[PDB]
Design a binder for these strands. Structure first.
Ligand SMILES: OC[C@H]1O[C@@](CO)(O[C@H]2O[C@H](CO)[C@@H](O)[C@H](O)[C@H]2O)[C@@H](O)[C@@H]1O
Ligand SMILES: [Mg+2]
Length: 580
DNA sequence: GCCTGACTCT
DNA sequence: AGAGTCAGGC
């Protein structure tokens, strides 16, 4: 059965109505500078398919695309907006994005095409993209009649589905979350991705060469100490060398044999010199394969920029993710790895990189939502939260907090945030379950409000079926009623963690929106380049630094008002590395 | 081609 | 707790 539509060869006025479902199809997973393979419009006057070489060269269609008062309903408008930016065309007036609507209604559905969103409301008159385009090697744009019918069915689905999605969003009290947060954020992310980040490829290559030399040296030491050559990057081959040839103790096994995970290796270190060398080899090898070679693979040779894609409709807690490359996991913890950041530079001469980050946003959020008196007071005094947590758990003065005590209190703070469990904490601090339970017990004695919150949120998740964040993002937790201890326990941790991690995600998203508006009002040339969960990275003329130093922290700090202050630290420099 | 297990980040 | 990428290997 084949849906009726006009296969148009020229644009007409009735295609330019002030309300329409719009499909601007980009089949390449990475949409940066990618082809647009077809366009479909469904509105009051009918259903239309347009070839892109026709539509995009029509002045009236382009004018309609960029006219803010002509409203469009779409799926994944950021994909279209970005593909259109590369062609020098502005997309405006997108008042409804079905991908973002589906994501807000239930992030666990993993909706990634119109068909999956449609299935949520018993609408099935549209094919999954994978059925049409195929998968992997055999992936391909089909012939025009098939392609056209597909885009029109997607448009028609968007047209039919807008009202029930908005209606449910409204009952969820998530209508503003879509309209005033996620959709405006989607435009901001499109600009960030399109702007891209400049890479000093010569610097990267130099680092690659030094790395290659050190890798060879560690590699040869490894063969020396094992008394033979083998594939160090083969967990199978390595396990044989470690646990059979060298007789190292077996403390952990994988599902598939011996575990050679990094924490297993740390413990083995005192037995044989080879172990530290393997850890080092693996550190350097990760830098080499992923942050030199992999990174250089995705730099555009023409502009020396990388253009990540932020997935805004993926994570279960409302964070963004980043791909091709992932710019949210660039090394920082170890100095040799952190040097990778010297290769990320401003895109114009006499510009600098500026980075601002919230300090302890998750614990500040927890203090607000739990209304824990002790925790709120700690932030009101702007104390070192880890030292203060140690003072309370160990019942000592600040003077008596040793480094090991602070380290352990820090670890409990992590656990408390992730949904605390004696097992997870024990694993982390290399201690017994009974020991870990005493820590948690001491914690809850010092922060009774936090304990009440943990109990109350788990009950609420049971009662309601979901938990929510500050700005009404929602996560359903059906395993919270499971009679399987481990399944139920995962869900209980999720109930505890999600309002924390998710409310922190909400706050920085709102900061981003506020920041973008302030930058425009101030006519600054500064631009957002990246978000890394609790931090924003910008580039700007060196002449705007002093202004950004006052502006960016204030905007981020005032994004929401909590029972405790938000605090933002900031730095700038000639490279991302230097913005520290 | 998918999987596993290893690594990277907040 | 939440993510993404890579080499080895089936
Ligand atoms: O365009 C991003 C948007 O598309 C989806 C599918 O609807 O993901 C596709 O694009 C991502 C970016 O290239 C890929 O990582 C992903 O594999 C691909 O299916 C959504 O998940 C995402 O929000
Ligand atoms: Mg921070």
């Amino acid at each position: 059965a084949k849906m009726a539509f006009t296969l148009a060869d020229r644009v007409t006025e009735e295609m330019l109505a002030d309300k329409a479902a719009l499909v601007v199809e980009v089949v390449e997973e990475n949409y940066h500078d990618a082809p647009i393979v077809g366009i479909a419009v469904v509105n009051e006057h009918g259903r239309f398919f347009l070839r892109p070489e026709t539509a995009l060269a029509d002045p009236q269609f382009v004018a309609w695309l960029g006219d803010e008062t002509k409203k469009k309903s779409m799926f994944d408008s950021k994909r279209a907006a970005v593909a259109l930016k590369w062609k020098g065309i502005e997309l405006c007036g997108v008042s409804f994005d079905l991908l973002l609507a589906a994501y807000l209604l239930d992030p666990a559905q993993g909706v990634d095409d119109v068909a999956a969103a449609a299935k949520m409301k018993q609408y099935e008159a549209v094919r999954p993209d994978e059925a049409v385009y195929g998968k992997g090697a055999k992936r391909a744009v089909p012939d025009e009649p098939v392609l056209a019918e597909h885009l029109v069915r997607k448009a028609a689905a968007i047209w039919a589905l807008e009202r029930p999605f908005l209606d449910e969003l409204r009952r969820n009290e998530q209508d503003r979350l879509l309209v005033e947060l996620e959709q405006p954020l989607s435009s901001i992310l499109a600009e960030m991705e399109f702007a891209g980040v400049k890479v000093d490829t010569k610097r990267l290559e130099q680092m690659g060469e030094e790395l290659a030399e050190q890798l060879r040296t560690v590699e040869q030491r490894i063969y020396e100490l094992a008394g033979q050559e083998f594939n160090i990057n083969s967990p199978k081959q390595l396990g044989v060398i470690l646990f059979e040839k060298l007789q190292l103790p077996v403390l952990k096994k994988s599902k598939t044999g011996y575990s050679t995970s990094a924490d297993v290796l740390e413990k083995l270190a005192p037995y044989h010199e080879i172990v530290e060398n393997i850890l080092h080899y693996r550190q350097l090898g990760k830098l080499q394969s992923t942050y030199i070679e992999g990174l250089l693979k995705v730099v555009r040779p023409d502009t020396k920029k990388v253009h990540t894609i932020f997935n805004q409709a993926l994570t279960q807690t409302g964070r963004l993710s980043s791909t091709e490359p992932n710019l949210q996991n660039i090394p920082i913890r170890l100095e040799e790895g952190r040097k990778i950041r010297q290769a990320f530079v401003p895109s114009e001469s006499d510009w600098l990189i500026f980075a601002a980050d919230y300090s302890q946003i998750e614990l500040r959020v927890l203090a607000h939502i739990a209304e824990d008196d002790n925790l709120m007071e700690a932030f009101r005094r702007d104390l070192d939260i880890h030292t203060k947590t140690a003072m309370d758990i160990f019942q000592v003065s600040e003077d008596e907090v040793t480094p090991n005590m602070r380290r352990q209190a820090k670890a409990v703070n992590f656990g408390i945030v992730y949904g605390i469990s004696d097992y997870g904490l024990a694993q982390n601090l290399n201690i017994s379950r009974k020991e870990a339970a005493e820590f948690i017990e001491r914690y809850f004695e010092s922060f009774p409000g936090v304990k009440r919150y943990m109990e109350n949120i788990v009950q609420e998740a049971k009662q309601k079926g979901y938990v929510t964040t500050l700005l009404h993002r929602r996560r359903y937790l059906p395993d919270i009623t499971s009679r399987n201890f481990n399944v139920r326990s995962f869900a209980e941790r999720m109930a505890m963690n999600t309002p924390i991690q998710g409310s922190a995600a909400d706050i920085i998203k709102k900061a981003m929106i506020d920041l973008n508006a302030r930058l425009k009002e101030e006519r600054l040339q500064a631009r957002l380049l990246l978000q890394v969960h609790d931090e924003l990275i910008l580039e700007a003329p060196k002449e705007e630094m002093e202004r950004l130093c006052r502006l960016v922290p204030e905007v981020m700090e005032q994004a929401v008002t909590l029972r405790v202050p938000l605090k933002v630290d900031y730095h700038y420099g000639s490279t991302w590395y230097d913005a520290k």
